[PDB]
Amino acid sequence: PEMVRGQVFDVGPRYTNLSYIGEGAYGMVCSAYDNVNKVRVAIKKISPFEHQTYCQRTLREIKILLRFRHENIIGINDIIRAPTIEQMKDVYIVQDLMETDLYKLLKTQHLSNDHICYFLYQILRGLKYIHSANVLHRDLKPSNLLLNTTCDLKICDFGLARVADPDHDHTGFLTEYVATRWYRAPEIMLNSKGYTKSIDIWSVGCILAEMLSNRPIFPGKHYLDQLNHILGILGSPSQEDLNCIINLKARNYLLSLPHKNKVPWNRLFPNADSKALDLLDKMLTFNPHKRIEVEQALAHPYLEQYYDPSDEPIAEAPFKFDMELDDLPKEKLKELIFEETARFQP
Numbered sequence: 001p002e003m004v005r006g007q008v009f010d011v012g013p014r015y016t017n018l019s020y021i022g023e024g025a026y027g028m029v030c031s032a033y034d035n036v037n038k039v040r041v042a043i044k045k046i047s048p049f050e051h052q053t054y055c056q057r058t059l060r061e062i063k064i065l066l067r068f069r070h071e072n073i074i075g076i077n078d079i080i081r082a083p084t085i086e087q088m089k090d091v092y093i094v095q096d097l098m099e100t101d102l103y104k105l106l107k108t109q110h111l112s113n114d115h116i117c118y119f120l121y122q123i124l125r126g127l128k129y130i131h132s133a134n135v136l137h138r139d140l141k142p143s144n145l146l147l148n149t150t151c152d153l154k155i156c157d158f159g160l161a162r163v164a165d166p167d168h169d170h171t172g173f174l175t176e177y178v179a180t181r182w183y184r185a186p187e188i189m190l191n192s193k194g195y196t197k198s199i200d201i202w203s204v205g206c207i208l209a210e211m212l213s214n215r216p217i218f219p220g221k222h223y224l225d226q227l228n229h230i231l232g233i234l235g236s237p238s239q240e241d242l243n244c245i246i247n248l249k250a251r252n253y254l255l256s257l258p259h260k261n262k263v264p265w266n267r268l269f270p271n272a273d274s275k276a277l278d279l280l281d282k283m284l285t286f287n288p289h290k291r292i293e294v295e296q297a298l299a300h301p302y303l304e305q306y307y308d309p310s311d312e313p314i315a316e317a318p319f320k321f322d323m324e325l326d327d328l329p330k331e332k333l334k335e336l337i338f339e340e341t342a343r344f345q346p
């Protein structure tokens with residue numbers, strides 16, 4: 001079997017001519033030539049940690065990506081694993097090869113207003129489908145937006161995704177959170193578990209700001225500093241928006257802060273399109289109840305060139321987890337991964 005940079009990467013005979021792209025969360029990522037479809041593909045290796053112990057996030061992502069079918073969401077083309085549970089160790093996930101991602105592109109390239117507009121449209125078009133399935137992505141950020149050589153955009157990494165659960169969103173002040181810090185909505189630090197669609201719109205707003213300047217808008221260095229970056233631009237929340245926060249420790253923290261002035265969007269982004277800044281303002285609203293929803297964002301004047309709801313498909317049914325994937329013994333999780341990946345065996 002074939003080897004890459006000292007590590008077993010055993011995907012052949014179908015996939016040959018491996019080139020090391022980089023690392024991921026559970027293993028190496030490579031490109032390879034697919035000898036059946038006669039194109040290069042991307043392949044990620046997933047290895048279990050310690051003793052036959054996989055991660056629930058691998059199962060979560062496989063289940064979602066196999067159910068979803070959308071032009072702006074990465075698909076799974078193939079899954080390679082041993083024919084039996086006893087022999088199963090590494091799992092390889094084959095997907096469309098994409099030239100780059102928005103993190104890489106923003107480190108190196110100024111975006112035209114036309115590119116920012118088109119990228120934003122495609123993010124929201126994919127997000128419309130995700131939210132129509134009652135799913136939250138929960139970790140939208142530039143590195144999770146793949147781009148091909150013609151700037152077609154696909155959302156990836158559904159490892160933190162969850163079914164929406166607004167009735168169970170409330171939590172105490174300073175509740176620990178898993179998703180990438182710079183893209184966390186203010187309410188995560190105050191009173192929210194990130195179980196509502198508004199969590200993802202905030203992340204999109206952060207991405208839009210980052211596309212306008214090539215710099216993250218709210219680069220917090222630690223958990224509470226993320227909130228202070230947010231307030232340093234939006235300014236102090238209004239009395240009405242504070243009254244929405246019933247939790248006293250969260251409320252009183254905000255009341256303890258000095259008054260902070262709003263930084264006008266046109267001063268932060270002096271080169272930006274005025275319609276882009278009006279939409280940014282609506283995505284980066286402090287109060288999640290006042291925050292624009294995905295379908296409203298699509299209908300905003302900034303996206304008028306692209307908006308076409310008949311060409312913005314939705315999911316056939318809401319997505320549901322059959323098992324609660326945090327409850328699971330490690331043997332049951334391996335079994336479920338084996339079963340979810342069965343359709344790719346010959």
Ligand SMILES: *CCC(=O)N1CCOc2ncccc21
Pocket residue numbers: 021029042074095096097098143144145146155156157
């Ligand atoms: C979300 C990241 C992802 O799924 N990756 C990692 C980068 O390379 C890559 N190429 C093709 C498809 C998916 C990915």
Ligand SMILES: *CCC(=O)N1CCOc2ncccc21
Pocket residue numbers: 240243244245287289290
């Ligand atoms: C906490 C109350 C709240 O969020 N409100 C009050 C009225 O204004 C408003 N507009 C839209 C969404 C939610 C609210």
